[model samples]
Target: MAQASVVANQLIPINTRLTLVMMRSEVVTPVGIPAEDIPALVSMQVNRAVPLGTTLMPDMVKGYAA
Candidate 1:
């Protein structure tokens, strides 16, 4: 799946509205993170800059020392 992002390469904040791109290869589970999983990630804040077209998962949202 081609999950589009709000930032070009910046910090995605909490409760961000992520785009479930209609470009995923449904048959290939590795194409991208499943679209349904986005809801669970609603409160995730990225710790780094994620590039455009970058395929992501739960790993993208990390718990760090604040």
Candidate 2:
């Protein structure tokens, strides 16, 4: 899937809305971390990035498929 990122690379222009939704057994699942912590983790994740307008929103999901 990382390679597929290149196919859509052109779409992520500067100042454009790009959402980063990262999830895995280690990131959100109970085995590694509690599900409730996902939001806080996500918040912190985006908090440290280029300051873009609120227009750029991330849609996170547990499943791999979009």
Candidate 3:
């Protein structure tokens, strides 16, 4: 995998449930940031990024820091 790809991915805000796997076999896991820790960031990331919530049918509640 190229360093550019890895760095590019980090530029995006990731939710706690999403995972990123590189071509080098490296696993990038979520940090589990609370929904309210940075509400704006979470909202932007979730809305514009991957793992659309509709596909995740989990029973867990999204904890918001605010």
Candidate 4:
């Protein structure tokens, strides 16, 4: 039997209103840190700070991260 896959990649413009689908495991947090060790962590600020009201869609944009 063949497995099915879902590829989600969309470049939503700024200030656009859209529902987000996220999995608990998909949530980004500090690397190599115990979940409970961190007293408090900001949402969506893992790895690198993500602009408010914007999502990092795979392949949404190409080029340097400047």
Clashes of each: 3, 0, 0, 0
lDDT scores for all predictions? 0.43, 0.28, 0.26, 0.28
Could you tell which candidate, 1 or 3, scores higher by lDDT? Answer: 1
The C-alpha stretches of model 3 lying farther than 4 A from their native spots are 1-31, 42-49, 54-66
lDDT of 1 by residue, 1-66 (tens): 354422223334443444333122232334444544555544455555555545554455554121
Better of 3 and 4 by lDDT: 4
Q: By TM-score, how accurate is candidate 1?
A: 0.42
Can you write out model 4's per-residue Cα lDDT over 1-66, one digit (the tens) per residue?
132111112433343332233111223322222223222221222333234433343223222122
Candidate 3 residue-wise lDDT, 26-47, digit = tens:
2223323322223223232232
CA lDDT for candidate 3: 0.26
Arrange candidates, best TM-score first: 1, 2, 4, 3
Poorest 10 consecutive residues by lDDT, candidate 3:
1-10
What lDDT is reached at residue 18 by model 2? 29
- Tell me the tens digit of each residue's lDDT in model 2 across 1-66: 111110111233433332334432222111323333433443232222333221222332222122
Q: What TM-score fits each model? A: 0.42, 0.24, 0.18, 0.20
Q: Mind sharing the TM-score for model 3?
A: 0.18
- Poorly placed runs, candidate 1 (over 4 Å): 1-32, 63-66
TM-score of 4: 0.20
Q: Compare the candidates by TM-score and give the number of the best one.
A: 1
Model 1 local distance difference test score: 0.43
Please give the lDDT score for candidate 4: 0.28
